[PDB]
Design a protein around this ligand. Structure first.
Ligand code: NAG
Ligand code: NAG
Ligand code: NAG
Ligand code: NAG
Ligand code: CA
Ligand code: CA
Ligand code: CA
Lengths: 217, 218, 217
């Protein structure tokens, strides 16, 4: 199947798959991966590597777990850092972030290009220009930063950001966005440890839905 | 353009011991593979679901193209696409079932001897057989023999645009007695007949919680 | 095909399926079966055979229907007794149960082993022994009874305990756990006919989430 197999959800849309769902694709080295395709948002063809929807999965996970990926196809997941690297290493994927609050308001953020490096470079975030988006730009702040988890500190803070904000991210000192934070359901008293996006609903409101997804430029 | 290679319907799949509802691949007429939702439970099981509404998560007020190719998500609401549905019902003779749930969790249903839609050439003309039964009453025969319409394709019998007037996409006459691709208005609504409505069921001013349209070989 | 594909969800996790979802496996007799793998909980690699989550599937069913299996891959289901049998047939696997109340508190129970008797010998519950559950042991009391359903009495009682409590279970005058009971959606005014587990919520409260699952040792 690797021969002439689809490489991204875009190929799958081009080839006539118009329903959002899980399909297998073939990574550059030919490894088959089953991924979530968003065929609807902003013209479709997006590969979704992060989804938050209901609080059912625990995102406070170690480096090994973020490495291989975790969660469920029936709901919330992180595709895996090795997987994300592979999806974004060769070519130019743009990045969309879709956000939904509990009052059912939708907001987004689109970036001109998105790439994460291999495990040897700490899954370094390399992020292109902010394009448009009502959610406002809350990821540029994180550009060119290593990824970190509770058991592996690569931040620019004297503490551990992933522990202080109970998540995992390309934290610097510490964060403006925190989509892998705890599912706190709306406004929360604690500071910045929920699924947050500063420019969007700020450090004190934890989104209901979060999706992170890539498409070839 | 039927495939003898493998399973042509959810019925075939049920027959080969697939007892759980879910997405499965069937083989249409030119052995074109399609992943479809099978209802393995309702009324003996083996129904292929081509329309599903559940939570209002997906926008159903879409244009011709979008309805032609299909839209939505396997995790939730979808319209299988008019090409797909035609392809599904062109060969043979399929029962149609409509299952409906209100927000008190009351179940209603309608059933029809046969259902097909013509190809795009003929505007996905609906061709419906006799009503068999159902607590929801018959709010579909009125639509027998009409072209499909969307908001950017008026093929109806009103001097206006039914799809715009009633925010949906359907085999609009002048205009309708069902509007299952209407807006998801959660129960009662004061607007007229622009919800997930079935006239003989909960009238023109109530929009259902769940709607499912499915076929099965007679 | 058969001699090269996985025979439990564990095998699939060892081959690098880190996300929970439906995958097909091959039983002892080479018949293929598509089962839900929990790749997440407790090291992952669990084949899930029962699942309650939203009360959308009628669990008030007969012998035949429990025999073949019923429900929706998208939601709630019973994998079916001769599958559950086929799975737990040759070898030995640990049963773990996972419960979640309508305020999002987690409770589980593990058992050294779990298997059901075949079509012939009714569906006799052959448990293992309790070992470390925050929801207590509400199943040891059921070890060694036949499965019974509204149309088949195999319990130790004058009336159908399954008709009494609208469930299907290894009953015996009567029950301490009613996982196939009704989804009475939390606090309820009838007795022992919800998705009940004594040690956990008592007899008049019905869980938000229930899952039973197995894994080799
Ligand atoms: C990928 C998929 O299944 N569809 C998601 C949907 O679940 C989400 O609620 C919304 C936010 O844009 O739309 C899509 O991103
Ligand atoms: C997976 C699926 O098809 N969904 C079920 C369907 O069996 C049925 O139409 C309806 C009640 O009839 O309940 C839905 O949730
Ligand atoms: C099945 C059916 O009733 N189709 C009819 C067609 O047979 C008839 O000629 C009528 C004339 O207006 O148009 C339409
Ligand atoms: C637990 C299980 O085996 N089922 C998965 C679970 O990992 C996930 O957290 C949940 C989300 O709805 O349901 C299923 O996708
Ligand atoms: Ca540090
Ligand atoms: Ca007109
Ligand atoms: Ca009895």
């Amino acid at each position: 199947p690797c021969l002439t197999g689809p490489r991204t959800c875009k190929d799958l849309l081009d080839r006539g798959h118009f329903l959002s769902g899980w399909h297998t694709i073939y990574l550059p080295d030919c490894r088959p991966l089953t991924v979530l395709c968003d065929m609807d948002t902003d013209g479709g063809g997006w590969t979704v590597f992060q989804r938050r929807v209901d609080g059912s999965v625990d995102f406070y996970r170690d480096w090994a777990t973020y490495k291989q990926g975790f969660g469920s196809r029936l709901g919330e997941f992180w595709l895996g850092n090795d997987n994300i690297h592979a999806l974004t290493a060769q070519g130019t994927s743009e990045l969309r972030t879709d956000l939904v609050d509990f009052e059912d308001n939708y907001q987004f953020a689109k970036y001109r290009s998105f790439k994460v490096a291999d495990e040897a470079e700490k899954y370094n975030l390399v992020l292109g220009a902010f394009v448009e988006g009502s959610a406002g730009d809350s990821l540029t702040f994180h550009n060119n930063q290593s990824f970190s988890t509770k058991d592996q500190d690569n931040d620019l803070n004297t503490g551990n950001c992933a522990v202080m904000f109970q998540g995992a991210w390309w934290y610097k000192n510490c964060h403006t966005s925190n989509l892998n934070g705890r599912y706190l359901r709306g406004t929360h008293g604690s500071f910045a440890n929920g699924i947050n996006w500063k420019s969007g609903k700020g450090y004190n409101y934890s989104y209901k839905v979060s999706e992170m997804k890539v498409r070839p430029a």
